[PDB]
């Protein structure tokens, strides 16, 4: 029943500002310390900030002091992390988390140890001056003449988009067996590209319909593409 849902990530020009939200459900935020923890792409975990609305106490990773402001609204059972003067070093997936040790005693001079038991889903904060570009989506058509493992393969190539992320889905979520969506790769152009593939019975090539559904929430664009054998 306990859930932590984030919001407010996305692209931001260097030096600009973003506000991240953390909506808690299934527990009161005053009974807890709420923390933010970020992860730069490919690097490890770094604690950023913490708040307890009950004590009115906030604490900041030195790496952000003064530029970040972490706050909470009890009426809304929600925590916020407002970020000002963002730098490239600030690009990361930001997570909110609840410390497992509740503010149990109502006495004030009590330091609590931190272990994070409930986490948000993570939102990406990207600090670049590049423009948002939506993806082009191209079929990866099978051949009945190129069968590998008794089965056939088909795909969607999702090319030249920024920023990440892109969600791919097949036949409106009705096909999940055999699907591999690849991690995105960053082209020399500075644009991203990935592809998503699915293995299917060799017989079903002409008989079945395969539509890939590509979602690029950063550009508010969703593309559906039917995949067919070339058939000239």
């Amino acid at each position: 029943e306990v859930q932590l849902v984030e919001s407010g990530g996305g692209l931001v020009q260097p030096g600009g500002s973003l506000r991240l939200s953390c909506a808690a459900s299934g527990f009161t935020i005053s009974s807890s310390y709420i923390h933010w923890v970020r992860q730069a792409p490919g690097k490890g975990l770094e604690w950023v900030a913490s708040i307890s609305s009950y004590y009115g106490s906030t604490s900041y990773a030195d790496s952000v002091k003064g530029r970040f402001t972490i706050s909470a609204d009890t009426s809304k059972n929600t925590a916020y992390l407002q970020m000002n003067s963002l730098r490239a070093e600030d690009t990361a997936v930001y997570y909110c988390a609840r410390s497992h040790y509740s503010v149990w005693w109502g006495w004030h001079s009590v330091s609590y140890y931190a272990a994070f038991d409930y986490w948000g889903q993570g939102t990406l904060v990207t600090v670049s001056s590049a423009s948002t570009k939506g993806p082009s989506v191209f079929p990866l058509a099978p051949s009945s003449k190129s069968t590998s493992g008794g089965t056939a393969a088909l795909g969607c190539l999702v090319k030249d988009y920024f920023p990440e992320p892109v969600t791919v889905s097949w036949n409106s979520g009705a096909l999940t067996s055999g699907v591999h969506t690849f991690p995105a790769v960053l082209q020399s152009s500075g644009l991203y590209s990935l592809s998503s593939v699915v293995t299917v019975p060799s017989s079903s090539l002409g008989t079945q319909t395969y539509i890939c559904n590509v979602n690029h929430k950063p550009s508010n664009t969703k593309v559906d593409k039917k995949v067919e054998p070339k058939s000239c």
């Binding site: 975990l45 140890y113 931190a114 038991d117 051949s143 590998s148 089965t151 795909g155 790769v185 058939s231």
Partner: protein
């Protein structure tokens, strides 16, 4: 007050005993936590207070302390256990360890290999993307070579590898070769060669085909 984690990466087989160690620079009481992170997902708490198993966490996980050294132990590795594991100290400033990538070791697995010509829609753009798919193989390292009219291609392809499958511990890999529409249109035979051990497979197509 820093947290040195060790080793940085390890491979071990299903059921092997895995031990990750964390080194605190000063004394952090017993307030140390352990997390399992699957790629791009939020970390999951495993151990808090250095020794206490978080509810829901399988019994195969345990934590222990010996002085300034906290260790996480997986008594018999499971294929769904590939992840990156982090130690964290529980007192301020809550430093995290460096991470320990746990990759799983299994039998050699042959890739199923497919090749895909570029689409006509992409051709109206002036660029051709040829994609070579290696499906459900192990180990991760495989030699993929591109040929265009039997000329080896270099410098114009990009690889992407999936994460390990959570039941069979295999990978899948994509190779994307990018060319000008003019370049693609002046050559006939496209081929992707996969080498693994003492077996090479080459998959191909001719531009004029159906």
């Amino acid at each position: 007050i820093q947290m040195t984690q060790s080793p940085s990466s390890l491979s071990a087989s299903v059921g092997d005993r895995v031990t990750i160690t964390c080194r605190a620079s000063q004394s952090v009481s017993s307030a140390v936590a352990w997390y399992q992170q699957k790629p791009g997902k939020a970390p999951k708490l495993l151990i808090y207070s250095a020794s206490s198993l978080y509810s829901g966490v399988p019994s195969r996980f345990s934590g222990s302390r010996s002085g300034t050294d906290f260790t996480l132990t997986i008594s018999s590795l499971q294929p769904e256990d590939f992840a990156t594991y982090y130690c964290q100290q529980g007192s301020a400033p809550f430093t995290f360890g460096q991470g320990t990538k746990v990759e799983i070791k299994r039998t050699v697995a042959a890739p199923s290999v497919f090749i895909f010509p570029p689409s006509d829609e992409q051709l109206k753009s002036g660029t051709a993307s040829v994609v070579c798919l290696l499906n459900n193989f192990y180990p991760r390292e495989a030699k993929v070579s591109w040929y265009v009219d039997n000329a080896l291609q270099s410098g114009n392809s990009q690889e992407s590898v999936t994460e390990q499958d959570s039941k069979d511990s295999t990978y899948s890999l994509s190779s994307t070769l990018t060319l000008s529409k003019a370049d693609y249109e002046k050559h006939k035979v496209y081929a992707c060669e996969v080498t693994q051990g003492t077996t090479s497979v080459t998959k191909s197509f001719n531009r004029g085909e159906c």
